[PDB]
Amino acid sequence: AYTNSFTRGVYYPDKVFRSSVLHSTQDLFLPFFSNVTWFH
Amino acid sequence: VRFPNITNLCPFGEVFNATRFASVYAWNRKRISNCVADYSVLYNSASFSTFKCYGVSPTKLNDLCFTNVYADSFVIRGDEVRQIAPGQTGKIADYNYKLPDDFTGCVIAWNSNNLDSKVGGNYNYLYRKPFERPLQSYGFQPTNGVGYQPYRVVVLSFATVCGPKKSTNLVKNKCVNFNFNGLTGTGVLTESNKKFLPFQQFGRDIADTT
Amino acid sequence: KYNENGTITDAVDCALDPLSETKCTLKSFTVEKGIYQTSNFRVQPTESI
Ligand SMILES: *[C@@H]1O[C@H](CO)[C@@H](O)[C@H](O)[C@H]1NC(C)=O
Ligand SMILES: *[C@@H]1O[C@H](CO)[C@@H](O)[C@H](O)[C@H]1NC(C)=O
Ligand SMILES: *[C@@H]1O[C@H](CO)[C@@H](O)[C@H](O)[C@H]1NC(C)=O
């Protein structure tokens, strides 16, 4: 059983406050629309 | 210079102010971890007969940080205290409590003539590779000479155990040289109207500037 | 995408598709009409000799 991760799996990569800005960063994130194993 | 509140210290008070100590053959080994380890008390206190460090300077202990620290705690006879050092031989150094020749740590000791010694003799302390834990007892009595007194010896063998960082007062609306946690710089500190999230420590401008 | 309050309100996965690649290259969640160079295509080796 697998489901669609959609657009979740994002977290704050650091402890830095940023506002009204688009910030580009590379870190370990869940790829969008990837498959996640679904357990009951 | 500003750092978080200096709380969460390691329990040196359970090592040096301990009610009971182990013998040298089978000494107690307490692990020191996950704290701000204040060594200024042990260094400056006049309660100790000796304070020596071999791998590090005894006055830099609050600047240094060690992965792990271990407190090897035992009672030995005064004349034999000199054996608790790297590169030594003797009844303790060879058969009871051996240190590495490349030992890094500090050896702290004080007399316990009014604590462990007993009038009829305290014979509960017995003696025979590095830190590798038949036997005879020590006749510890309050009436014997200095070299015959019991001494309480703690060896701190040397990341989660870091020295304390003392903060200064903060002055606003003036040009200062600041140090906040992990960053430094020069600027004027003023009250902001920013709303940081509970886990955010620093703010950043658009072009990667604090 | 950070809002006025320091939170992340949106995000682009820069390797999801060609439009996302464009958005990350331009560093904008919306893009104007036009043609943009975003990457480099390379045929990969399949064997080892
Ligand atoms: C895994 O993801 C692909 C899309 O990349 C999708 O076509 C496929 O059906 C998914 N697998 C499962 C078991 O859902
Ligand atoms: C032990 O307690 C005494 C209380 O008189 C204090 O002076 C000393 O600094 C303490 N040391 C430790 C390691 O707790
Ligand atoms: C910021 O938080 C305040 C509540 O303190 C709220 O009224 C405001 O709309 C928030 N701003 C944004 C951009 O979400």
UniProtKB/Swiss-Prot annotation, chain A:
Glycan attachment points: 35
Protein name, as recorded: Spike protein S1
Its biological purpose: Attaches the virion to the cell membrane by interacting with host receptor, initiating the infection. The major receptor is host ACE2. When S2/S2' has been cleaved, binding to the receptor triggers direct fusion at the cell membrane. When S2/S2' has not been cleaved, binding to the receptor results in internalization of the virus by endocytosis using host TFRC and GRM2 and leading to fusion of the virion membrane with the host endosomal membrane. Alternatively, may use NRP1/NRP2 and integrin as entry receptors.
Organism, scientific name: Severe acute respiratory syndrome coronavirus 2 (2019-nCoV)
Subunit and interaction comment: Binds to host ACE2. RBD also interacts with the N-linked glycan on 'Asn-90' of ACE2. Cleavage of S generates a polybasic C-terminal sequence on S1 that binds to host Neuropilin-1 (NRP1) and Neuropilin-2 (NRP2) receptors. Interacts with host integrin alpha-5/beta-1 (ITGA5:ITGB1) and with ACE2 in complex with integrin alpha-5/beta-1 (ITGA5:ITGB1). May interact via cytoplasmic c-terminus with M protein. May interact (via N-terminus) with host bilirubin and biliverdin, thereby preventing antibody binding to the SARS-CoV-2 spike NTD via an allosteric mechanism.
Domain of life: Viruses
